[model samples]
Target: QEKLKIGVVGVFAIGCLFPLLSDFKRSYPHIDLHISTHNNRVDPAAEGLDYTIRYGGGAWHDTDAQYLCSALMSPLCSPTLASQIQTPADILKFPLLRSYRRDEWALWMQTVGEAPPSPTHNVMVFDSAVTMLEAAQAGMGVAIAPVRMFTHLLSSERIVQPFLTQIDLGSFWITRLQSRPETPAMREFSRWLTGVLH
Candidate 1:
């Protein structure tokens, strides 16, 4: 059997797609998954990749892109941290590490009720969601994270949801250049991926 070659981009692919790839390889056994992690912003079409997965922004509308999955965003905390939330007011006291949206605290405050005295007490900032999640797990601070990325933590009760408010971060896409020919292996892998993601 011929292995399918795929070129993946973006940082989230490391935490999200890598685990799925391991499972996918076990099931399929013949697909060759070649991945390249980028700085969360790269042009899959120009990079000459068969497929790419990206988070945090919209895909280029002028390219050939297939929507893969959209993640549900929720507030996450460790079990110890969750138990400490006695009130909505308690939420305002903790340090929040802003990943991309600096105003997330303000938005969360506005959504729940009153704004905090100020949203300026964030102790850490990072360019990737994964980093923020790591900080949260370390009990450094609360982070706004995609639930899917931290599924294991949530299921095992290592983390807990403090609220039910879910913010949609838009859909991730599996994309290739519009003019490129889609090989049989590529097509099969794409179909399998859609199922795996579901």
Candidate 2:
């Protein structure tokens, strides 16, 4: 039996999935799991990685990929902010960091009631969701974060649900070179990994 090496990209693995990996390791003790967490999504092909987890609309470079999870944008705020909200429409009145795709807000509005007038200028523009989450925690502005990614923050009262409406961002996938043959170890690991999601 040989260990299976896997490379995971983006912040979710560290912030969210790392804890899950412990159980995964326990269940599949035979599979030696090599993990790498990258701050930004990288081209797995360029790095010759076995697989990667990324947050975006779809696969990088249209490569052959397998769907992992479909996550939604569940915006969170501080308790103080959450208490002040009375309706979904109230969200538009507050300063919002419109860093995510504009569609996120639109979808949220569609889910709740109706979209408010677009802001003439965004409150803050961040390069990543983590930055936005930081700002939100600091009470700077609201950020659209993947709820699962910030469970610790939410559980600890660092953030709260401002609105009940969650916007779907679509699915994230795990991908490798389609031509590469999956060894028994790799196949077992993939099954275990996907099982964790379920």
Candidate 3:
């Protein structure tokens, strides 16, 4: 049996991929699937992983990357906060929670043909999308995050999507060091992942 190590960002690990691992394991009993979660600050070769599933534009200088899916950014908030929002403009009234990328909100706003909201208060920044969404769920403020990844929360009513407008900040990518040789397990896992992501 061969061991396959993969590095993943926290949001996809928890919200998107972790739930599917058991099914993947059930389908491939012989391959050891090892997962390590990071905050999108990992180097696949340095970390000794067979693959790294990253959330960003498909760009890495020395790595090979394949597009997985689009992570459409939208504003998510608690049901209480959602009541205050009627249009996309209403989102300007609340504190916007975001990851380090400062332009995500602006980009989404631009898509809706609205002016970027001016900061009325200090912007809350998080390193992980999971944490930002958690903050939104706790009734802190509006969190602009990937709408697709947190469908369970949307379905269960933990968070409410205030608007239909979503922006493509980036996407999830399966990456490997260009110097690394692809193995049978890697090929199998890639195929399975591509199938599942679609």
Candidate 4:
């Protein structure tokens, strides 16, 4: 068995990757996986990690990054709140919940060809997408997030996507430091992740 260490951004970890882990383990029984979650900032070499799955365009300095998938941002809220949301503009009536980025709602508005509303005073920001969605599910407000990551929530009826309008904030990437030598374990895990995610 070979050990593979990986770091993942928090949103991607919960929204997409974590659910597929058991399948990876089943297929690669000899591969030992050590996965840790991060909040965007990560140093693969300094952290002694083989790879890091991050959310962004493939532009991180000196890293070998491969595109995994596009993260389509959409408005998500509770069913109760969703019922009142009849159009893209309706989302602006609720308090917007977000994770770090304040301009996402404005960007999404532009995608739908609507003029961006004035920034709301009631906008709440959370450090993680998980908690932001939790607040949305609790009927706190609308949260803009990648629809791909939260399909389970939609399917389970725990949350609702009030509009079909979506914007591409960025994509998920599997990345490694340029200076790090690729071991067979790293190659295998990378291939597995790429195949599964793509």
**Candidate that scores best on TM-score:** 3
Candidate 1 residue-wise lDDT at 34:
64
Cα error, residue 141 of model 4, in Å, equals 1.0
User: Candidate 2: TM-score?
Assistant: 0.80
Model 4 agreement with the true structure over 20-127: per-residue lDDT tens digits? 999898878899899999877776777898899888889988889998899888899999998888988788778888778768977888888888777544789887
Alpha-carbon lDDT, every model? 0.68, 0.69, 0.88, 0.86
The pairs that clash in candidate 1 are: none
Model 4 lDDT-worst window of ten = 113-122
Compute each candidate's TM-score over C-alphas. 0.79, 0.80, 0.95, 0.93
| Model 3 agreement with the true structure over 1-198: per-residue lDDT tens digits | 899999999888887898889878887888988889998888777789999998988988888898888898899999999999998888877888989987988888889989877866547999999999999999888999888889989999999998888888789999989899888999998888889877
Residue 65 shift from truth in candidate 4, angstroms: 0.2
Q: At residue 166, give the lDDT of candidate 4.
A: 82
Q: What is the lDDT of residue 51 in candidate 3?
A: 94
Q: Whose lDDT is higher: candidate 1's or candidate 3's?
A: 3
Top candidate (lDDT): 3
Residue 16 displacement in candidate 3 (angstroms): 1.7
Higher-ranked by TM-score: 2 or 4: 4
Candidate 1, residue 146: Cα displacement in angstroms equals: 0.8
lDDT of 2 at 37: 66
